[PDB]
Design a protein around this nucleic acid. Structure first.
Ligand SMILES: [K+]
Ligand SMILES: [K+]
Ligand SMILES: [K+]
Ligand SMILES: [K+]
Ligand SMILES: [Mg+2]
Ligand SMILES: [Mg+2]
Ligand SMILES: [Mg+2]
Ligand SMILES: [Mg+2]
Ligand SMILES: [Mg+2]
Ligand SMILES: [Mg+2]
Ligand SMILES: [Mg+2]
Ligand SMILES: [Mg+2]
Ligand SMILES: [Mg+2]
Ligand SMILES: [Mg+2]
Ligand SMILES: [Mg+2]
Lengths: 31, 235, 35, 57, 53, 154, 88
RNA sequence: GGAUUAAAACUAGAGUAGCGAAACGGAUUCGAUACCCGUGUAGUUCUAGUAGUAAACUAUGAAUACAAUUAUUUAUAUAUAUAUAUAUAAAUAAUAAAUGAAAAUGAAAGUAUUCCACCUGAAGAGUACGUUAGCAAUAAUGAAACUCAAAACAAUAGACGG
């Protein structure tokens, strides 16, 4: 796939990583 | 008639009077348009417990003998499984004997080497006394001992030459005889074939009946068998 | 030359002729010829 | 657990064939490159003897 | 088409073949053995220059 | 070997494309029978036994001493700027062998697709093997023989 | 002959195994050892089919058993721990 | 099924010059959580482990048979009027044929055979849930609903380019 199309997968991966970091943080405070 | 199958015994000695036999049948698979082999394992009754894993057997349908047994062993077509068991037992005994003999031949060789290391006398020195005593006339008792260390009772110039003989020398002469035989056999047959008249005579002289009436291959083999019977039997 | 060589560093020919009764069966032959 | 567990790489420990070959390689006067001491002692003595005979011809 | 595809070796042909093959293996073993002895002789000639004492 | 036969069929197609007049194939009974059928049917100009280096001019008996160096040499035909032997393909493949009864062979020669085998076309040769003998399908039908449908040549 | 090949491989397997026991991180030569052991299994499996009597004689003399030859072998980490290849 | 597997990351103990996430400062800027500069922690190093992921790419699984040329190296062999010449393989480069959506491939992406892996519109999604494994980060496995008549590749002619 072209770079243009790769960039859509890149954005999805970033948003998943951002959400999992956010969830981790909460667990630390809630723990 | 009763349905009979051919299969390979794939399990034995796990159940009492029961063996597992692998039966392969030929079926047509419409989807891939190919005649395939379909495999199934049968639990089979072995009344005499004769079959062994690896055997090729014929199984025949019987009355129900258990929840899952509906066939029995009817004949051992090939007994490779039984052979395996016999050869394994023999191997244990056969190898033990050989290893014992080899262990005794290794300790014997070690003893001889140790004994020789206890004799400070060296071949060179001993061969320098048998060549000085033979050139000076002195006969110290060392020579008598040397006549026992080597067994050389007589001390001559043709006794040191036989104490220092190397096996390579014998090999060189056996190789020349081997080459001679091959070269002679080829020249003899080569010449014989070149002269049909001398060939026909050759065969008759060696006891062939009407060799003239023979084929090239049917007769060249006779010539080859004779040329190799006149250079290997007479020698 | 082989066995009948004058080199200080000879080849196995000399050692082979010795153990094959050649350097001796030739020395006697030469001496017998001289006789 | 009662199965005869033979190491598939090294085999049974103390195999007479494996042990004897190992011992043969560690014998006192074993030589390399295909030479054997017995043949080397006779060959070296033959060189000396052969030289003397060449010095007696 | 009628000719046989293969003619098996006659027992005599197999005997001469075995003689040549045994000779080939034996000659190579002998030639290697003699080469080693010739190298042992050339090493004896120079061992007077080597130090062991 | 059907694999060897597939190799030969592909080899003949490659040689036809470049228009070489003479080529060699492995020396085996199946290969010889295959080539002989093509020769009698007019697909091959010549069929000679030989060696890896070329066809034999004089008869050379084949023995175990030279079997590994034996080859069969076949001459390809070209007329009017077209190869006579354009295509050569197996029907019965190594991984899917097809055995047909004489009744189904007659249907194949009559325009009916049997077991996905396209029917015999005008001027095409379909070879069948029966009891280790190779013959044209029409000859097998004449002899009432059942056999493996090996290949089709056009 | 398969018996000779197995014996020749045995010598090299024994030597290569000794090397690995002193060079446990030499994965390149561990891979070579694995392949050589598997090659010996293949040659002996053929021997069992070709000459069963010789096969059983050969494996007995080499110190192996039928299971060691016929069973699938990968010389994996569990093997190195179950037979204490490296000791401790 | 097994083994090995970059970088980052983690466990334990050593090491720590230089480099350098982060953090704290200096600049730039309308703003500058940046690009540039300073101080520089983890890390980068070694030992013993965990983990098994990369654009882990030739984006091209492995094996076998086969097909037209040239050039250039390499290797082996042969010869001599001894330094070249003649052979046979391999590698690489450019090609014929053939193949292909074309770009191109070229001894395969050709002609064939055998075996394995994998794919079936886009998005949702390599996500959710469950499970297995790991100290952990995570890794493997891996959907459906809803919505749409799209979506993608090669090539062509333009336009534009700090
Ligand atoms: K019962
Ligand atoms: K540091
Ligand atoms: K790359
Ligand atoms: K694969
Ligand atoms: Mg893709
Ligand atoms: Mg193998
Ligand atoms: Mg640390
Ligand atoms: Mg900085
Ligand atoms: Mg690991
Ligand atoms: Mg990942
Ligand atoms: Mg991946
Ligand atoms: Mg890489
Ligand atoms: Mg391979
Ligand atoms: Mg995941
Ligand atoms: Mg494009």
């Amino acid at each position: 796939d072209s770079v243009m199309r790769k960039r859509k997968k890149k954005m999805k991966k970033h948003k998943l990583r951002k959400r999992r970091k956010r969830e981790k943080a909460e667990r630390r405070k809630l723990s | 008639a009763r349905q009979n199958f051919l299969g390979l015994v794939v399990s034995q000695g796990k159940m009492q009077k029961t063996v597992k036999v692998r039966v392969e049948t030929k079926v047509f698979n419409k989807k891939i348009n190919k005649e395939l082999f379909h495999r199934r394992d049968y639990l089979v009754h072995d009344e005499g417990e004769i079959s062994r894993e690896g055997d090729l057997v014929r199984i025949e349908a019987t009355r129900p003998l258990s929840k899952r047994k509906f066939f029995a062993i009817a004949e051992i077509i090939r007994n490779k499984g039984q052979q395996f068991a016999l050869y394994e037992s023999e191997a244990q005994l056969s190898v033990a004997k050989e290893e014992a003999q080899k262990a005794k031949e290794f300790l014997d060789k070690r003893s001889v080497r140790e004994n020789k290391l206890n004799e400070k006398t060296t071949l060179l020195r001993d061969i320098r006394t048998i060549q000085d005593a033979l050139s000076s006339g002195s006969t110290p008792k060392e020579l008598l001992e040397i006549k026992q260390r080597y067994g050389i009772q007589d001390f001559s110039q043709e006794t040191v030459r036989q104490l220092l003989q190397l096996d390579i020398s014998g090999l060189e002469v056996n190789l020349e005889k081997q080459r001679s035989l091959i070269d002679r056999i080829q020249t003899r047959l080569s010449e014989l074939l070149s002269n049909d008249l001398k060939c026909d005579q050759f065969l008759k002289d060696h006891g062939v009946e009407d060799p003239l009436t023979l084929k090239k291959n049917i007769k060249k083999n006779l010539l080859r068998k004779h040329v190799m019977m006149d250079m290997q039997q007479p020698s | 030359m082989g066995s009948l060589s004058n080199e200080k560093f000879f080849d196995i020919s000399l050692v082979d002729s010795y153990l094959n009764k050649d350097l001796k069966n030739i020395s006697n032959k030469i001496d017998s010829k001289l006789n | 657990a009662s199965t005869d567990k033979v190491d598939p790489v090294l085999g049974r420990a103390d195999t007479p064939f494996i042990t004897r070959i190992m011992a043969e390689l560690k014998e006192p006067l074993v030589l390399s490159k295909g030479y054997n001491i017995e043949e080397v002692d006779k060959f070296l003595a033959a060189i000396e003897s052969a030289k003397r005979e060449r010095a007696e011809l | 088409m009628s000719q046989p595809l293969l003619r098996n070796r006659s027992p005599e042909e197999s005997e001469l073949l075995k003689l040549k093959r045994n000779y080939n293996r034996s000659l190579l073993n002998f030639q290697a053995h003699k080469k080693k002895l010739n190298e042992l002789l050339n090493l004896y000639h120079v061992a007077n220059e080597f130090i062991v004492t | 070997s059907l694999v060897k036969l597939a190799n030969t069929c592909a080899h003949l197609q490659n040689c036809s494309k470049v228009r070489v007049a003479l080529t060699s194939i492995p020396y085996t009974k199946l290969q010889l029978q295959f080539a002989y059928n093509l020769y009698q049917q007019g697909f091959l100009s010549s069929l000679q036994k030989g060696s890896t280096m070329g066809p034999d001019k004089d008869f050379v008996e084949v023995t175990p001493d030279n079997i590994s160096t034996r080859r069969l040499w076949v001459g390809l035909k070209y007329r009017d700027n077209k190869p006579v032997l354009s295509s050569c393909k197996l029907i019965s493949k190594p991984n899917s062998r097809i055995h047909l009864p004489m009744e189904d062979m007659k249907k194949l020669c009559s325009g009916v697709t049997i077991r996905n085998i396209k029917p015999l076309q005008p001027g095409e040769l379909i070879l069948v093997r029966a009891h280790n003998n190779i013959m044209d399908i029409n000859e097998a039908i004449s002899k009432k023989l059942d056999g493996e449908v090996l290949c089709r040549v056009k | 002959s398969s018996e000779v090949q197995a014996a020749c491989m045995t010598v090299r397997i024994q030597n290569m195994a000794n090397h690995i026991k002193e060079h446990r991180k030499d994965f390149a030569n561990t891979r070579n050892l694995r392949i050589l052991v598997q090659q010996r299994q293949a040659i002996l499996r053929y021997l069992k089919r070709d000459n069963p009597e010789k096969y059983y004689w050969t494996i007995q003399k080499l110190g192996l058993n039928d299971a060691a030859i016929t069973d699938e072998f990968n010389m994996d980490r569990r093997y190195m721990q179950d037979y204490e290849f490296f000791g401790d």
